[PDB]
Design a protein around this ligand. Structure first.
Ligand code: MG
Ligand code: MG
Ligand code: MG
Ligand code: MG
Ligand code: MG
Ligand code: MG
Ligand code: MG
Ligand code: MG
Ligand code: MG
Ligand code: MG
Ligand code: MG
Ligand code: MG
Ligand code: MG
Ligand code: MG
Ligand code: MG
Ligand code: MG
Ligand code: MG
Lengths: 57, 124, 141, 185
RNA sequence: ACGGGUGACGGGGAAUCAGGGUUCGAUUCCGGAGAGGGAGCCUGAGAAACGGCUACCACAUCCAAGGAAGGCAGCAGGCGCGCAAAUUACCCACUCCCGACCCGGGGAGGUAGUGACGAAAAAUAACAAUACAGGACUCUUUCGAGGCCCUGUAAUUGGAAUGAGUCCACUUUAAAUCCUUUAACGAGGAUCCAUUGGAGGGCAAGUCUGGUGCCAGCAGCCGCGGUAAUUCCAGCUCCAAU
C-alpha cells in the first residue's frame, strides 16, 4: 500500500460554492470606531455570563 | 499681497557684498519668482536690480511664508568676479559649454596614448 | 555557586565554562559536528532538485499517507526528504524540478505525524507553492 | 563613507502577551475615546510615558542636593508642565509617577480641536486636521498627534485658507455652484 | 605554557535586558592587513606600492606563430556561486583633497535610478435630516405614550469637504527630479473596491451550513479526521494586527 495517486482528493471533489458579493468593510480608524461602538456603547449586560461575538446556536 | 522682509543683514567688505535672509510673505499665492524678489528687494534697498542674486528659497507648510538667501553687490564687475558660475548662468550673464564628463574623460584617456603635438590631432 | 571566596573568580569561570558543555542547547550550537550533519549548514533555505515524489506513512494513532519529496540539495549534493505541505500540492511539483526548501519549525527535529522529515517546500520552479495553492499564480510551462 | 545620519529610533513597543482580553478591552476603550487609528498609537504614548516614568525613577534613587538630580528633574518637570500633562500645583518629582496615558492623549491636537468647539466629534476633529483646516500660531498643521502646549492652546483656530474659516469655498461647493449656473448660463 | 581550532581583523559600539548577564560587531569612525598566491626591488621624505617594476606559480587577452599585453577585495557592469544584495546614470554646485595652482583634475564625494533591510509621520471617510433599537427622563401597577434630551447602524435621502491621481507656473537644483507653494480638473455602491493569518485548548475569535469519511489533509505542542468533524476542504460570520 502507500498509494500516491490519490493526492488532493477532497479539494478536487469538494463542491464549489462561489463567493458572494458583499458590502465593503471600512478600514483603519473607522473600523476601530465601529468596533468600539459595538462593544462599549450599544450593548447591554447579560444575565450570568456574557455572549460570544460569533455565537450562532 | 506679496511682501518681502530682510533678516540677518550683514555687509561684507571682503567679497564686496551685502548678505541677508529674505522672508517672502505671499499668502494665498504660489511662491514668488526670483526676478520679482530681486526687483522688490531693489526698490527696498535703493539699488539697481542687476546686481542682486537671490537663491535657496523654501516655502513653509501652509504657505504663508518663504525663506531664502540673497546677496547684493557693490558693482556688476565684482558680481561677475566673485560669484558662483551657476548663479551667473541663472542670471544668464554666463554660458558654460555643453560638454559631457564621460566623453571628456574618454578624450583625455585617448590623448594619453599619444605623445608630442598629436594631442590636438586626436580630436575630430 | 558553592565556593565563594574573593580569589575564586578563576574557579567559578572555569567550572561554568566546563559545565556549559553538558548543556544540550550549548553543545549543539558550539560544536561543529551538528552544523556538519545539518543538511542546510546554517542556512535557513536551500534550493534542490526533485528526485522523487514519495509517500511516507504516518506514525501511530494518526494514520495517513503524507506526500513528501525526495530532494537533492545543490550546495551540498546531499539528498533529503522534504514535506509538500497542503492539499493537492504534489501535482504542482514535478520530478526533475528545482524547489526551495525550508525547515518545518523545530530546528532539525521530526515534526508531528511524520517520521524523520524536518524540511518542507515553499517554492517550486521559482513560484511559491502557497500562490499555486491559492490560485494567485499558475505553474509556468 | 557617506554624509548621512542613520540615527533612527522605534517610537513604540508591542506588548508581551498578544491576546489578553484585560489589555485589549482597555486599549480599544482609549482608541474609541480618542479617535486613534490603531493600537500602535496607543503604544507610542505608552512608550513615551514609560520613558518619562523610567527617567523619573532613575532620578528618584539619587539623593537630593546633587546637581544632576536637581537639573534633570527640574527640566523634566518644566517640560511636563509645559506640555500640560502635569499641573503646576504638583511640580514635584514624585508626582511624575502618578501620570496616566489619558492625560497625554488629552494633549493631542485631535483632542484639543474637539474640546475647543472647532469640531463635533473626535473623528470629525481628526478628518478636519487631516484636511488642512486647523492652524496653530499661523502654522497650518495636519498631524493629529501634535502635542499642544499650555500656552499654545490659546491660538488654535481654523486656517485662513479653509472654507470653515475666512477662505475660498472648496471644490464640491464650487463645482455645484458652477455646474448649476453653467447649465443656467 | 606549548599546540590545535575559530562561520576570529580588533576597538569605539549593536541587540536583548529588573539587578546581574547573554549574543553580535564583514560594515560608513580609529588602528591593522592585503590587492590572484608567494617572493624581490627601483624611485622617493614617506612603498617592500601593486590603477609601479621584476620573476616564478595559477588563470587569462592579441598574433603574419616572430612577439606583446595583464591584475575591478575602486565606480558601474557581467559570469559563476548561492537562501541571500541596486545604474555599464549626472555633476565637480557642496564637502574636502592634490598640483607650478583664485583658473585644472577628482566614480573621493555629492545628486538622482532600483530599493516593504529597517525607522518616523499618516488616507481608505466625516457630518446633518428621516427612520428604527436603546438608555435617560414627565407620567404610567403594568401594557404605554410623548418629546424636553442624547447615542448606536440602516443598500434611506442629502448637501458640505478633502486627499491620491491628471496637470500650468514658480521654487528646488550644477542641471533637474522629489518635497513644499499654487492655478485648473479630480468621489458616493466616495468600484478612487486592505490585506495577512487564524476561529478546540494554549490563545482573542461559531459547537453555523455543505462536502469528505483515519482518505484527503489540519496540527509549533496537546491533538482533529473511523458517516452527526467546534480542528480537513469551501460558504457565511467573527477575532487579531494593520
Ligand atoms: Mg506527536
Ligand atoms: Mg576569518
Ligand atoms: Mg567591525
Ligand atoms: Mg568573513
Ligand atoms: Mg600594501
Ligand atoms: Mg578576485
Ligand atoms: Mg606587492
Ligand atoms: Mg585595480
Ligand atoms: Mg592603491
Ligand atoms: Mg536580499
Ligand atoms: Mg567640488
Ligand atoms: Mg562611490
Ligand atoms: Mg484602498
Ligand atoms: Mg472554517
Ligand atoms: Mg487556540
Ligand atoms: Mg476563547
Ligand atoms: Mg485548530
Amino acid at each position: 500500500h502507500g498509494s500516491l495517486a490519490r493526492v488532493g482528493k477532497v479539494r478536487g471533489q469538494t463542491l464549489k460554492v462561489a463567493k458572494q458579493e458583499k458590502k465593503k468593510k471600512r478600514t483603519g480608524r473607522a473600523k476601530r470606531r465601529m468596533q468600539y461602538n459595538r462593544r462599549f456603547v450599544n450593548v447591554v449586560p447579560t444575565f450570568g455570563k456574557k455572549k460570544g461575538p460569533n455565537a450562532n446556536s | 499681497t506679496v511682501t518681502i522682509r530682510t533678516r540677518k543683514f550683514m555687509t561684507n567688505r571682503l567679497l564686496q557684498r551685502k548678505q541677508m535672509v529674505i522672508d517672502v510673505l505671499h499668502p494665498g499665492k504660489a511662491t514668488v519668482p526670483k526676478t520679482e524678489i530681486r526687483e522688490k528687494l531693489a526698490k527696498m534697498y535703493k539699488t539697481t536690480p542687476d546686481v542682486i542674486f537671490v537663491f535657496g528659497f523654501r516655502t513653509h507648510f501652509g504657505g504663508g511664508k518663504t525663506t531664502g538667501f540673497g546677496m547684493i553687490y557693490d558693482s556688476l564687475d565684482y558680481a561677475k568676479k566673485n560669484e558662483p558660475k551657476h548663479r551667473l548662468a541663472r542670471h544668464g550673464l554666463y554660458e558654460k559649454k555643453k560638454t559631457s564628463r564621460k566623453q571628456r574623460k574618454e578624450r583625455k584617456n585617448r590623448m594619453k596614448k599619444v605623445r608630442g603635438t598629436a594631442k590636438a590631432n586626436v580630436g575630430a | 555557586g558553592k565556593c565563594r571566596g574573593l580569589r575564586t573568580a578563576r574557579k567559578l569561570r572555569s567550572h561554568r565554562r566546563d559545565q556549559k558543555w553538558h548543556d544540550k542547547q550549548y553543545k549543539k550550537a558550539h560544536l561543529g559536528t551538528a552544523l556538519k550533519a545539518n543538511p542546510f549548514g546554517g542556512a535557513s533555505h536551500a534550493k534542490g532538485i526533485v528526485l522523487e515524489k514519495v509517500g511516507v506513512e504516518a506514525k501511530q494513532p494518526n494514520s495517513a499517507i503524507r506526500k513528501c519529496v525526495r530532494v537533492q540539495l545543490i550546495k551540498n549534493g546531499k539528498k533529503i526528504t522534504a514535506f509538500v505541505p497542503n492539499d493537492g500540492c504534489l501535482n504542482f511539483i514535478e520530478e526533475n524540478d528545482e524547489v526551495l526548501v525550508a525547515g518545518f519549525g523545530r530546528k532539525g527535529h521530526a515534526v508531528g505525524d511524520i517520521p524523520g522529515v524536518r524540511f518542507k517546500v515553499v517554492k517550486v520552479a521559482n513560484v511559491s507553492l502557497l500562490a499555486l495553492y491559492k490560485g494567485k499564480k499558475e505553474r509556468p510551462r | 563613507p557617506v554624509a548621512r545620519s542613520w540615527v533612527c529610533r522605534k517610537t513604540y513597543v508591542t506588548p508581551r502577551r498578544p491576546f489578553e482580553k484585560s489589555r485589549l478591552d482597555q486599549e480599544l476603550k482609549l482608541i474609541g475615546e480618542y479617535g486613534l487609528r490603531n493600537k500602535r498609537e496607543v503604544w507610542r504614548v505608552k512608550f513615551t510615558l514609560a520613558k518619562i516614568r523610567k527617567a523619573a525613577r532613575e532620578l528618584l534613587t539619587l539623593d537630593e542636593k546633587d546637581p544632576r538630580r536637581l537639573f534633570e528633574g527640574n527640566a523634566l518637570l518644566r517640560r511636563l508642565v509645559r506640555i500640560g500633562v502635569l499641573d503646576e500645583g504638583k511640580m514635584k518629582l514624585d508626582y511624575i509617577l502618578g501620570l496616566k496615558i489619558e492625560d497625554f492623549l488629552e494633549r493631542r491636537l485631535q483632542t484639543q480641536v474637539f474640546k475647543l468647539g472647532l469640531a463635533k466629534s473626535i473623528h470629525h476633529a481628526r478628518v478636519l486636521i487631516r484636511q488642512r483646516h486647523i492652524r496653530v500660531r499661523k502654522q497650518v498643521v495636519n498631524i493629529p498627534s501634535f502635542i499642544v502646549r499650555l500656552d499654545s492652546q490659546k491660538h488654535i483656530d481654523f486656517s485662513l485658507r479653509s472654507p470653515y474659516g475666512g477662505g475660498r469655498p472648496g471644490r464640491v461647493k464650487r463645482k455645484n455652484a458652477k455646474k448649476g449656473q453653467g447649465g443656467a448660463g
